[PDB]
Design a protein around this nucleic acid. Structure first.
Lengths: 388, 388
RNA sequence: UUUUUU
RNA sequence: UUUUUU
RNA sequence: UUUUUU
RNA sequence: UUUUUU
């Protein structure tokens, strides 16, 4: 019989229903006034402890379908979410004007009623659902990293979308605390980011400006936090027309054990399907099976072999446990790649002048790449110096 | 006939029902007020001698299903527990406000009534079931070791989850005695840790923040206390594509007898199934069959061969009965691994420059690993010096 | 009459 | 009785 | 716990 | 983010 079954026995389980969470959907006569009240409430700086979910669902409903309940509850995303415990019920309500009247009067929301009662119900702003969903969707790249990377990326991206004149934003939405509130709201919830991802990756044509911004952010926020998967699968586990061959820097025993464990975890992620490259954003099942430190030898070698080719990967930070191995790996890969290019140039049957000009071209290209990486390493050291 | 049947005759028994323990489930109109009273009661610092089980069950019921009795009593975990003597009955109760009124008035709980009667029923706190279950689930890694390792690990993990801004905890829950009370409650009971493990390993998607913390702690608390299983099955009992071969440091007679006894105990554990790597936490049947001292020769040799490869296993403590054998085993494995790597590099047909750079790379990697283990051993000696 | 160690 | 690192 | 560039 | 000429 087999004995090694116990190690990986619990990785692959069946599929059941464990949550059973029920979400209400309000069907109100007027909708745009309520959406303006919700946007004004989030601009006021308050939070909803549990009841934010129905509000964001109704806002996304107004943006997408413009008030079509029968087609919304027969969609594909709602059909997907009912296979994981979500249950959407529908409630009706007459002409209301206040979110306290719309609130289901839960005693835990006493502080919510206290904050919304102090909110002045007289001021009006100028926005809609599309601007709010685009400005929330800008946070999706680099969301796993932290606050500072998110703020730097979104302050770059607003200026990019302001130069190419698609959409302008109000200046009150560029204060720091408002961005902090939207960052916390995007980090805690689940439903809003799944709706943004599904709507961004399942449109075909007929895009608006807000849909263009959402689809651009979804396309840029791919494989965020899974750099180990790209750096292993591109170089270390190299695909040939015959089959799959290992890199010659990975032919020991311990690294081979790491490769086998990595193949098991990769199959555990590939269970999912179309939503697999977004996993760290959606925090799926087999996400915790792939971490740094659980693959100590393979990670640094894979990152060194990857940063030997590309010149932009020198800016990534690792830690004080892998750096010297990374340096040894990238130097060995540089010299092996130089020898391989020289032998491959000597392979084909050509003239001497063609070989001379190709050697000159390869030498100049290697010099340019060396200078760019030498600049990038000093820029990373300057970043870590300016951090403290 | 056979004569060796008597030694292992009692290891494998049949399956019957020996306990027959009955647990009540209270069905009350209001639930969140009672959950706040229970959390305030555990913050007060009192204990429940027998009646803690129904309280924790009702709290987990409020967190998971939000008050769905009919779907809870038809779940998978409750179906599993009825095969081992647990019997859940359901009782109803009108609008109550005090845990004395909810208590079934047992004369052994006279001290419980005395402590809860002295508890002031006026103060209110700010928490819920999810924060309490996550803060209780943080104790699951390193729970078998002792108090100090638990407190150090959870004070690390709270700061980790505070940097990556998912969840903040109240500062009153970080005093020492409160953590002691929750440690004692987690060590004595059984039902709460089984519910946490099942809910953590059977979700697929749709995680909340508290569910993310619980699933992370369940994933990190795997094979806790069964290091001998990993260190034997990874190296000593090495799997080949042909079959299973023994390590050349384990080809004597006594070690072969230890291997046969280990195979018998491994089959006794593999009887269980999906809950097998969690066994020392759940304290299952064949747990006591695998102990240190019952395998005197195999344990130290296996740990030495394991710590020859990895550089973090040098920090484990053993005792004054295995240390010199561990040292001899790890030195022999270092020199055998060096000779094997040199011969394997000399195996393949390549160029001289490639062999030169691969030898240089292997030499530098071995130097880095040697320096890291030399640091880790002195750190362990410093720990044992600072212990007394 | 049994005599360790876990 | 368990003793690392994630 | 993740750490680049688009 | 695209960057010419017709």
């Amino acid at each position: 019989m087999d004995y090694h079954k116990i190690l990986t026995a619990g990785l692959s389980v069946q599929q059941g229903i464990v949550r059973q969470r029920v979400i209400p959907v309000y069907q109100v006569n007027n909708l745009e006034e309520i959406c303006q009240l919700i946007i004004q409430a989030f601009e006021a700086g308050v939070d909803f402890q549990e009841s934010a979910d129905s509000f964001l669902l109704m806002l996304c409903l107004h943006h997408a379908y413009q008030g079509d309940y029968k087609l919304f509850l027969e969609s594909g995303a709602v059909k997907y979410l009912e296979g994981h415990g979500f249950r959407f019920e529908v409630k009706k309500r007459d002409g209301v004007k206040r979110l306290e009247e719309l609130l289901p009067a839960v005693s835990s929301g006493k502080n919510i009623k206290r904050t919304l009662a102090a909110m002045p119900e007289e001021e009006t702003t100028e926005a809609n659902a599309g601007q709010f969903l685009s400005f929330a969707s800008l946070f999706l790249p680099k969301l796993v990293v932290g606050e500072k990377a998110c703020l730097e990326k979104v302050q770059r991206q607003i200026q990019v979308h302001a130069e190419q004149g698609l959409i302008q934003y109000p200046t009150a939405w560029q204060s720091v605390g408002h961005m902090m509130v939207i960052f916390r709201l995007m980090r805690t919830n689940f439903l809003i980011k799944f709706l943004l991802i599904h709507q961004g990756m399942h449109m075909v044509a007929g895009h608006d400006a807000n849909d263009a911004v959402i689809s651009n952010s979804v396309a840029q926020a791919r494989f965020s936090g899974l750099l180990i998967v790209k750096t292993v699968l591109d170089h270390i586990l190299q695909k040939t027309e015959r089959g799959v061959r290992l890199h010659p820097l990975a032919r020991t025993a311990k690294v081979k054990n790491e490769v086998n464990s990595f193949k098991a975890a990769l199959s555990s992620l590939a269970k999912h399907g179309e939503y697999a490259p977004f996993a760290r954003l959606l925090n799926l099942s087999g996400v915790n099976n792939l971490e740094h430190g659980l693959f100590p030898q393979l990670s640094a070698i894979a990152l060194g072999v990857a940063t030997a080719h590309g010149s932009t990967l020198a800016g990534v930070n690792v830690g004080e446990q892998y750096q010297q191995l990374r340096e040894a790996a990238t130097e060995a890969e540089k010299q092996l790649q130089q020898y391989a290019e020289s032998r491959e140039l000597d392979h084909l049957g050509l003239d001497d002048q063609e070989k001379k000009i190709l050697m000159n071209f390869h030498q100049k290209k290697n010099e340019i790449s060396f200078q760019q990486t030498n600049a990038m390493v000093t820029l990373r050291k300057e970043r870590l110096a300016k951090l403290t």
